[PDB]
Amino acid sequence: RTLDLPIYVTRVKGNNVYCLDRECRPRVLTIDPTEFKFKLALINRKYDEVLHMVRNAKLVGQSIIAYLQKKGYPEVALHFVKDEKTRFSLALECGNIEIALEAAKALDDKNCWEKLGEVALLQGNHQIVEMCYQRTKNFDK
Amino acid sequence: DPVYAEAYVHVNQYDIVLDVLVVNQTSDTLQNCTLELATLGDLKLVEKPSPLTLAPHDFANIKANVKVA
Amino acid sequence: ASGNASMVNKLAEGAERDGKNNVAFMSYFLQGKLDACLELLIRTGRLPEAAFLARTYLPSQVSRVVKLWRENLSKVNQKAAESLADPTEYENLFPGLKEAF
Numbered sequence: 058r059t060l061d062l063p064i065y066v067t068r069v070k071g072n073n074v075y076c077l078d079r080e081c082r083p084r085v086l087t088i089d090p091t092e093f094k095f096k097l098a099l100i101n102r103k104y105d106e107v108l109h110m111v112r113n114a115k116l117v118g119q120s121i122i123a124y125l126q127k128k129g130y131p132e133v134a135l136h137f138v139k140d141e142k143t144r145f146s147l148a149l150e151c152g153n154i155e156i157a158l159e160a161a162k163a164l165d166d167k168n169c170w171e172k173l174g175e176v177a178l179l180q181g182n183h184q185i186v187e188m189c190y191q192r193t194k195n196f197d198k
Numbered sequence: 199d200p201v202y203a204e205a206y207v208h209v210n211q212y213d214i215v216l217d218v219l220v221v222n223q224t225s226d227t228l229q230n231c232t233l234e235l236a237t238l239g240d241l242k243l244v245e246k247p248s249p250l251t252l253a254p255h256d257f258a259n260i261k262a263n264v265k266v267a
Numbered sequence: 268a269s270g271n272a273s274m275v276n277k278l279a280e281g282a283e284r285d286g287k288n289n290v291a292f293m294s295y296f297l298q299g300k301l302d303a304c305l306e307l308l309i310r311t312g313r314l315p316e317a318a319f320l321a322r323t324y325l326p327s328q329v330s331r332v333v334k335l336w337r338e339n340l341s342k343v344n345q346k347a348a349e350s351l352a353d354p355t356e357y358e359n360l361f362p363g364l365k366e367a368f
Contacts, residue, residue, distance in 0.1 A: 059202040118206025118217050179315055180348070 058089045104132050113137035126150060145169070154180060161189070200224050201252050205260075214241065216262035220252065227251025241266045272298060279303070288313065301326045314339065325367030329353075330360065 063078040074086035094106050115121035115137050125133050131151040138147055138156075141163045148157035154177060164170055174189030190198060200223030208217050222228060230250035236243060244265040247258075275298050282291035288311040295303035301324055308317035314336040321328035330353045340348045352358045 059204055061199065061202075114204075114219075116217060117204045117219060118208050175315075181350075 058086060099129055102130065102132075104130075104136070107136055121150075131155070152180070167193075200255065201228065212266040214264045214266060216260075216264065218260035218262065219257065220260055221257040222252035223255050223257070224252040225254055227253035227256075238264065305332075323367055327360075327368065 076084035178186040203220035205218040
């Protein structure tokens with residue numbers, strides 16, 4: 058759940074959440090945990106929750122960086138993710154090469170490709186990789 | 199508030215850029231206040247997305263570029 | 268242009284000298300020497316590629332080599348990244364029975 062100007066967490070009184078900036082700038086709070094559910098949930102692959110919440114950041118400065126940067130599944134990608142550029146970043150970060158494929162189609166930042174087909178190969182499929190390279194002018198290759 | 203705005207700074211290549219989430223989970227493009235420009239250091243802040251609504255239940259990206267030299 | 272092995276041995280020696288991977292290969296080939304091509308790869312870290320040769324014209328290093336490549340991959344864990352089989356399963360190597368030996 059998000060704060061409300063300065064607050065400090067003092068400690069936790071039950072579910073009816075309580076928060077303090079020091080002695081004012083205060084909360085009673087309907088909760089909304091994140092994480093707990095999550096590394097357990099995650100640990101059991103489970104998404105249902107997040108999803109269900111429809112909770113969806115990954116950036117605030119960043120926010121993918123707990124371990125969503127050091128990703129845990131691309132199932133994560135699925136809860137949230139955006140622009141082809143962003144998507145692309147994911148395409149490396151996850152290595153989401155599904156998103157890459159399209160991403161690629163949509164990339165056209167060469168270098169980007171340029172590494173990537175190999176990488177793609179590296180991960181698999183040269184049947185495809187050949188194409189990738191085909192426009193890439195690694196003709197000789 | 200519903201409107202929750204969360205923000206952090208990203209400094210992406212020279213440019214210190216302001217990620218802002220103003221999320222207006224508001225019950226409407228609630229009216230918004232005011233913002234002011236300024237000379238800064240070897241930088242100057244330099245952008246504001248113009249509107250001042252806090253669109254209902256809605257999330258927004260407000261970007262501030264800063265001028266980094 | 269006239270062609271020559273002898274030139275090639277001395278040159279091979281040279282080939283070793285030159286410092287970019289690629290020429291040396293042609294040589295190795297040119298001589299006819301898978302072995303040489305493959306050894307060369309070991310130094311450069313040509314690994315995916317080395318596997319193709321090792322497969323195509325079979326010195327069955329595909330088995331040997333694949334394990335190592337896979338190991339790198341392995342280092343960079345994820346099961347898909349690991350990737351596994353030689354005679355049977357994922358690959359059926361000698362059970363496939365097809366065109367390089």
